[PDB]
């Protein structure tokens, strides 16, 4: 499958930016763009051979892990750390069968009982996104936790917390130029801070925003979506135009109108 | 005032296109653009010295006339043909006073009792836009009619009909890239044909389209505007996005939101 490499060791805003441009470039075919926003491939009819891309992450401690991203939604589906592969609970037969094509060469393959969505992951992590730190240092740490899961070195709460950081720093930054900007600021000043309300509200409404845009009357939404600003003030979106510098990829919801 | 020259003698699609790009360039300051469409200057606070531009038209018969265009709406306000100037009925004191600054050097100045809007002009012309021919040949003819008005050569129905052709080939083509395209086709094939429904419906709703766009919720219209296709099928516009390749200039209706 395509593999993209990124190391947290000595990451700068440009090597991180290059990494996220490369992931978006693998996720998209260029075939489907609606109101200037690329739509991800539709899962019905996609061949297994084009279903996943892999992301190989390395850290300052010279440890690596490879995450498998699903190309229809850019979400992390499972991962490899040396001799073992772990996959989240497939929530349908089609996906149960698809993940058998990943990391076939690994000896021990495990499937967790829990899925990879945020709520399960926050329950298991014993903590919410609002309290978990994101930045180059948290991702550095996450690479190690994930890698030492193999050998009893990581307990399930640190595993879940490391999954939340990976998914927001890779999958969500690819879904949104806005969240990628948020991560670049953290790297520029080498800060680590929990996500503010605008980040979490964007992440929660990615699927609904994709549908509202694709079902729109020429860009006009039938019902408005309320998002939040950094300080928590709510605001309504009525049109795709203001989301164009904010969302970078949409999940396929319907075919483009005539 | 700025003056732009155009001759119907040997007009091609590029000399006509150059002429309409020059008129739009004089009408607009570049200061106010909303959803990629330029807004014309607001009449409250505009100095008289920047209120009009002049368009000097010549034809194959080596006759000229100069029309005065109002810069707040690109409409024809009056005209000069040699020793005489004629102005439409000013419909307010502010405009009565403004037109005194035009063609001051002419000996005979007249103000018609009728205004220049389409209905009055169709009544006087004894004919509707749907039946009047537009093209390089009708504009050629209009230049002569307008010029011979001075000397009893043109009767008021031909005067009104010549005003309808000038206003659609200059003011409306500047208001709309669409109507300018319509006129370029006529010149390319040297055809003359009356305007179809999409043209007349655009002309009739220029003012309402300007307000709907400037009062929009981020591009989304509160109420849709029904326009017509060439064959007369009605269709609704819900968003400014589809009007962007169609309208080139908007009349000022309100100040741009924060
Ligand atoms: N495999 C996954 N990895 C990370 N986040 C996910 C995954 N699947 C879903 N999500 C996100 O978690 C939340 C709930 O997911 P879901 O239960 O499929 O709607 C939504 O914000 C999803 O975008
Ligand atoms: N001076 C003018 N010359 C040509 N058309 C005009 C002029 N003033 C208004 N119109 C158009 O004629 C119609 C009626 O004008 P009004 O009576 O001002 O709304 C509308 O389509 C206007 O855009």
From B220, B237, B242, residue closest to A239, measured CB to CB: B220
DSSP strands (E only) in B42-129:
52-58, 64-70, 76-81, 84-87, 108-111
Q: Which residues pair with B78 in a beta bridge?
A: B68, B87
Active site residues of B: 172
Residue B87 beta carbon below 6 angstroms from any ligand 2 atom? no
Hey, what domains does chain B have and what are their CATH numbers? 1-174 (3.40.420.10), 175-258 (4.10.470.10)
Residues of B within 8 A of A221 (CB-CB) are 220
Residue of B nearest to A243 (CA): B218
Q: How far is CA A40 from CA A79, A149, A177, A204, in A?
A: 21, 32, 15, 18
Q: Which resolution, in Å, applies to this structure?
A: 2.8
Identify the CA nearest to B39 among candidates B75, B1, B72. Answer: B72
Q: Which residues pair with A225 in a beta bridge?
A: A237
- Work out the number of other CB atoms within 10 angstroms of the CB of residue B178: 18
For residues B145 and B196, is the Cβ–Cβ distance under 8 A?
no
Closest ligand by atom to B117 CA: 2
CA distance A91 to A88: 9
For residues B182 and B203, is the Cβ–Cβ distance under 8 A?
no
Name the 3-class secondary structure at B198.
helix
DSSP strands (E only) in chain A:
3-7, 33-34, 37-38, 52-58, 64-70, 76-81, 84-87, 108-111, 220-228, 234-239
CA distance B160 to B122: 7
Helix or strand holding residue A135 (H, E): none
For residues B107 and B121, is the Cβ–Cβ distance under 8 A?
no
Residue A70 beta carbon below 6 angstroms from any ligand 1 atom? no
CA distance A241 to B241: 9
Residue B90 beta carbon below 6 angstroms from any ligand 2 atom? no
CA distance A113 to B7: 80
**Contacts with A210 (C-beta within 8 Å, 6 or more apart), sequence order:** A39, A250, A251, A252, A253
Q: Is A45 exposed, middle or buried (0-12, 13-18, 19+ CB in 10 A)?
A: exposed
**DSSP secondary structure code for residue B250 in this structure:** B
**Contacts with A173 (C-beta within 8 Å, 6 or more apart), sequence order:** A20, A179, A180, A182, A183
Tell me if chain A has a CB within 8 Å of the CB of B223: no
For residues B179 and B249, is the Cβ–Cβ distance under 8 A?
no
Q: What is the largest CA-CA distance in chain A?
A: 55
- Whose tokens are 């109507």? That residue is B179
Q: What does R_g of chain A's alpha carbons equal in angstroms? A: 18
Distance from CA of A229 to the nearest CA of B (A): 16
Å from CA of A104 to ligand 1 middle: 25
> Which experimental approach was used here?
X-ray
CA distance A42 to A73: 9
CA distance B227 to A12: 52
Residue A1 beta carbon below 6 angstroms from any ligand 1 atom? no
For residues B134 and B162, is the Cβ–Cβ distance under 8 A?
no
Q: Are strands B108-111 and B84-87 parallel, antiparallel or unpaired?
A: parallel
* Mutation target among A34, A218, A225, A235 for the B interface, most CBs of B within 10 A: A218
Å from CA of A102 to ligand 1 middle: 20
For residues B68 and B102, is the Cβ–Cβ distance under 8 A?
yes
Q: What is the dihedral of CA A87, A89, A94, A98, to 10 degrees?
A: 0
């Amino acid at each position: 499958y395509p593999i993209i490499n990124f190391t947290t060791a000595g990451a700068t805003v440009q090597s991180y930016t290059n990494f996220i441009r490369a992931v978006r470039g693998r996720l998209t075919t260029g075939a489907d763009v609606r109101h200037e926003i690329p739509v991800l491939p539709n899962r019905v009819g996609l061949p297994i051979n084009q279903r996943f891309i892999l992301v190989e992450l390395s850290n300052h401690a010279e440890l690596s892990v490879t995450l498998a991203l699903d190309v229809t939604n850019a979400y992390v589906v499972g991962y490899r750390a040396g001799n073992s592969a772990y996959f989240f609970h497939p929530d349908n037969q089609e996906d149960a069968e698809a993940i058998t094509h990943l990391f076939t060469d690994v000896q021990n393959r495990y499937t967790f009982a829990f899925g990879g969505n945020y709520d399960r992951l926050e329950q298991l992590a014993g903590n919410l996104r609002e309290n978990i730190e994101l930045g180059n240092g948290p991702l550095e740490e996450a690479i190690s936790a994930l890698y030492y899961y193999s050998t009893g070195g990581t307990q399930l709460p640190t595993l879940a917390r490391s999954f939340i950081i990976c998914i927001q720093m890779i999958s969500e930054a690819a879904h949104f130029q806005y969240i990628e900007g948020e991560m670049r600021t953290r790297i520029r000043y080498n800060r680590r801070s929990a996500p503010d309300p605008s980040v979490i509200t964007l992440e929660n409404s990615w699927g609904r925003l994709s549908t509202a845009i694709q079902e729109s009357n020429q860009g006009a939404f039938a019902s408005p979506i309320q998002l939040q600003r950094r300080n928590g003030s709510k605001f309504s979106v009525y049109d795709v135009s203001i989301l164009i510098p904010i969302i970078a990829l949409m999940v396929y919801r319907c075919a483009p109108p005539p």
